[PDB]
Amino acid sequence: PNFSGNWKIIRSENFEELLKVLGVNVMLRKIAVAAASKPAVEIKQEGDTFYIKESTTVRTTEINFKVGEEFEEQTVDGRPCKSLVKWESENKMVCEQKLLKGEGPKTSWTLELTNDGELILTMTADDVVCTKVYVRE
């Protein structure tokens, strides 16, 4: 499976409620949600090594990791964390996140590529799941 590409969002479900349950205030949710309607996700995969950049109008995040090796990133609500990605199957990776400072809800995310060329991101915080689906440009 090759995740490399420029990805455009085609579905999103439960994003704002995910932010809400994480205690993100209304002002910021509105902005995040407005802005997340027009994102850009760029992925460069070389075997188990990945570079992933997401951009909205108001935020940008970039990560470089190798499956199986711990790296630093942020939770969906902007909290610094140590992450580890593992392959669940040939086309699906899963990431467990641990906060660097303090405690909080258990967060994770997964990325899977479908046979039809769609990229499915799920993000979970405890028992609230958000799904987003992308296609290549």
From Swiss-Prot:
Record's note on what induces expression: By retinoic acid.
Recorded GO CC terms: cytoplasm; cytosol; endoplasmic reticulum; extracellular exosome; nucleoplasm; nucleus
SUPFAM superfamilies reported in the protein's UniProt record: Lipocalins
Posttranslational modification: Sumoylated in response to retinoic acid binding, sumoylation is critical for dissociation from ER and subsequent nuclear translocation.
Coiled coil regions, renumbered to chain: none
Source taxon at top rank: Eukaryota
Key word Electron transport present: no
Keywords: Cytoplasm, Endoplasmic reticulum, Isopeptide bond, Nucleus, Retinol-binding, Transport, Ubl conjugation, Vitamin A
BP GO annotations: embryonic forelimb morphogenesis; epidermis development; fatty acid transport; positive regulation of collateral sprouting; regulation of DNA-templated transcription; retinoic acid metabolic process; signal transduction
Major subcellular site: cytoplasm
Disulfide bonds: none
Pfam families, per database record: Lipocalin (PF00061)
Gene Ontology molecular function: cyclin binding; fatty acid binding; retinal binding; retinoic acid binding; retinoid binding; retinol binding
Location of the motif Nuclear localization signal: 20-30
CDD domains, sorted: CRABP2 (cd19461)
Localization per Swiss-Prot or TrEMBL: Cytoplasm; Endoplasmic reticulum; Nucleus
rRNA-binding among keywords: no
Covalent link Glycyl lysine isopeptide (Lys-Gly) (interchain with G-Cter in SUMO), residues: K101
InterPro entries (alphabetical): Calycin (IPR012674), Fatty_acid-bd (IPR000463), ILBP (IPR031259), Lipocln_cytosolic_FA-bd_dom (IPR000566)
Residues the entry annotates as binding all-trans-retinoate: K132, V133, Y134
Entry domain remark: Forms a beta-barrel structure that accommodates hydrophobic ligands in its interior.
Chain's role: Transports retinoic acid to the nucleus. Regulates the access of retinoic acid to the nuclear retinoic acid receptors.
UniProt xrefs under PANTHER family: FATTY ACID BINDING PROTEIN
Quaternary data: Interacts with RXR and RARA. Interacts with importin alpha.
Family under the similarity heading: Belongs to the calycin superfamily. Fatty-acid binding protein (FABP) family.
This protein's name: Cellular retinoic acid-binding protein 2
Organism of provenance: Homo sapiens (Human)
Gene (UniProt): CRABP2
